[PDB]
Amino acid sequence: STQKFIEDNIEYITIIAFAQYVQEATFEEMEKLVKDMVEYKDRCMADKTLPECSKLPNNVLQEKICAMEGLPQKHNFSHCCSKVDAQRRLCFFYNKKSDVGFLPPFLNHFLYEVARRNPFVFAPTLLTVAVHFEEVAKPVTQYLKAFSSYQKHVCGALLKFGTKVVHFIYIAILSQKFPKIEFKELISLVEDVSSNYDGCCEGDVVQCIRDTSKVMNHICSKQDSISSKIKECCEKKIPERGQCIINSNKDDRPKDLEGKFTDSENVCQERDADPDTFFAKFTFEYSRRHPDLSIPELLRIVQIYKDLLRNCCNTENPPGCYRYAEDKFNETTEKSLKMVQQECKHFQNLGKDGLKYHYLIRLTKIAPQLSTEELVSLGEKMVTAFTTCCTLSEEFACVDNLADLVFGELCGVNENRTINPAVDHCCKTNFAFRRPCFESLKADKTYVPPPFSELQRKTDRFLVNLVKLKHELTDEELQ
Ligand SMILES: *[C@@H]1O[C@H](CO)[C@@H](O[C@@H]2O[C@H](CO)[C@@H](O)[C@H](O)[C@H]2NC(C)=O)[C@H](O)[C@H]1NC(C)=O
Ligand SMILES: C[C@@H](O)CN1CCN(CC(=O)O)CCN(CC(=O)O)CCN(CC(=O)O)CC1
Ligand SMILES: C[C@@H](O)CN1CCN(CC(=O)O)CCN(CC(=O)O)CCN(CC(=O)O)CC1
Ligand SMILES: C[C@@H](O)CN1CCN(CC(=O)O)CCN(CC(=O)O)CCN(CC(=O)O)CC1
Ligand SMILES: *[C@@H]1O[C@H](CO)[C@@H](O)[C@H](O)[C@H]1NC(C)=O
Ligand SMILES: *[C@@H]1O[C@H](CO)[C@@H](O)[C@H](O)[C@H]1NC(C)=O
Ligand SMILES: [Gd]
Ligand SMILES: [Gd]
Ligand SMILES: [Gd]
Known about the structure:
Blueprint: H1 2-8, H2 10-21, H3 27-45, H4 61-67, H5 71-74, H6 78-81, H7 85-95, H8 108-115, H9 123-131, H10 141-161, H11 165-177, H12 183-202, H13 205-220, H14 240-247, H15 260-263, H16 267-273, H17 275-288, H18 295-312, H19 319-322, H20 325-348, H21 352-366, H22 372-387, H23 396-411, H24 423-427, H25 435-439, H26 455-469, H27 475-478
PDB class: transport protein
Keywords: Afamin, glycoproteins, hydrophobic ligands, conformational variability, Wnt-signalling, gadoteridol, transport protein
Assembly: monomeric
């Protein structure tokens, strides 16, 4: 099983866990833990029933980190060690910092200097971009920076909206990626992936391999009863196989080109029967029939539909009103697609930099409490969405998926943030409707500024500071 892999890479698996949780730590300190864990494992191979060996492999990791001589004082995390094992795991999670400018620029030494610079990335990923980093003659950064962004974006969602929206996300994700799948199958594969994100986000490295491998087992076991593009991925070795399936393209779709949720007369009953399944089923069926849409849109629609029935199943002749839920989608969808086209012309009528400067002003205008480097970063992640996939088929399926990531960054990953009462309302309200929430924000009315007085980053920093300074002015002035 995977159980072998975890013991084989224990050196790495410990390094990552530590490095992420405590980014401020040295490599000297990493070796100290590595030995304790290695020796600990051998004692668990020296006795099957040893009291320390009935313990879970992360609440061992964090107990040693805390036990380690004056380490919590030297990296300000003593308050995490003064908590019960569960509260301590959550604390250690809150301890992980995303804005890592306080560190210097730049296997075991690499995994240290990645993990502590990329703390929220999943273990499977890092270990894959070690095997997929073991080169011979002198790129890959592109892949890692992307895989962090979606993992942070979900572990964001999980924190703020609990363990319900993450399901809906991964129904829309997997149903769109694997249309040939069946509901009862996929819904199980989701309550695996959802239960995986519980441990991967919290930072439980060891589980994030177990539950990740369990998920890839769950796919490959129904290989040609799910997909036909990941055939050579299931022949790859842990955890390449993990990131192979994830990195692959969406399945070719069946011969079927639905209206049970609209046409039927007992929709309220099937909704009242078991809501979250009924909705889960609606997101399943609508997703697999729309592989040219965004993940945020496939939730916006499901939410809108949940709102439609909520207003419908409380009136004489229910169906009459939810008859054209189908048409109400093709409306709100085509509006959103055309709205992407309106900003993909602003791109042509400015270019990378020209648009970059537009957003930075805007992004700062609405959220000027943020850091200049924080606001700068988003401005490049935002323009990356338009850089690629904003002049081709499914240009909406991307720019929406990709722009949504930059608001998760803004709203924070592992903290309930206080930016301004409006940006806060866009973050801590609804996951689906945060992009349109942000799109509808004017200048931060309530803001009291402080004093002030590469080249591309330098330019941006200047603009963001210039905007923060002259915040009482308008978009066209500052340009
Ligand atoms: C990080 O840890 C250090 C050491 O525990 C903290 O420094 C102490 O601060 C308290 C009150 O702020 C004083 O009573 C101690 O005398 C300080 N000791 C030393 C050696 O400085 C520091 O406050 C912690 N930083 C944060 C942000 O919590
Ligand atoms: C719509 C475009 O996204 C099409 N896209 C353009 C190339 N992308 C750029 C990007 O990610 O926007 C980088 C490589 N890409 C990354 C990935 O998806 O895993 C793999 C191939 N993808 C699979 C997919 O899209 O699901 C389709 C090709
Ligand atoms: C497919 C995997 O790559 C999973 N993926 C990992 C991160 N990706 C990296 C990248 O896309 O290059 C970006 C996210 N993605 C953007 C897009 O696909 O255009 C939307 C959400 N997807 C849904 C899906 O398309 O399966 C799940 C997240
Ligand atoms: C009637 C429409 O407004 C339905 N609406 C469509 C999109 N909205 C736009 C908006 O908020 O007017 C944003 C989503 N919305 C945010 C919010 O309302 O705070 C959460 C869900 N709401 C719940 C409600 O408030 O009835 C219904 C969704
Ligand atoms: C953030 O708020 C949500 C809901 O209000 C809550 O579930 C979550 O635990 C909070 N996270 C914190 C305080 O870190
Ligand atoms: C929604 O729009 C798509 C794309 O043009 C179209 O193929 C589909 O038939 C439309 N659906 C409805 C119900 O009008
Ligand atoms: Gd002991
Ligand atoms: Gd993706
Ligand atoms: Gd792609």
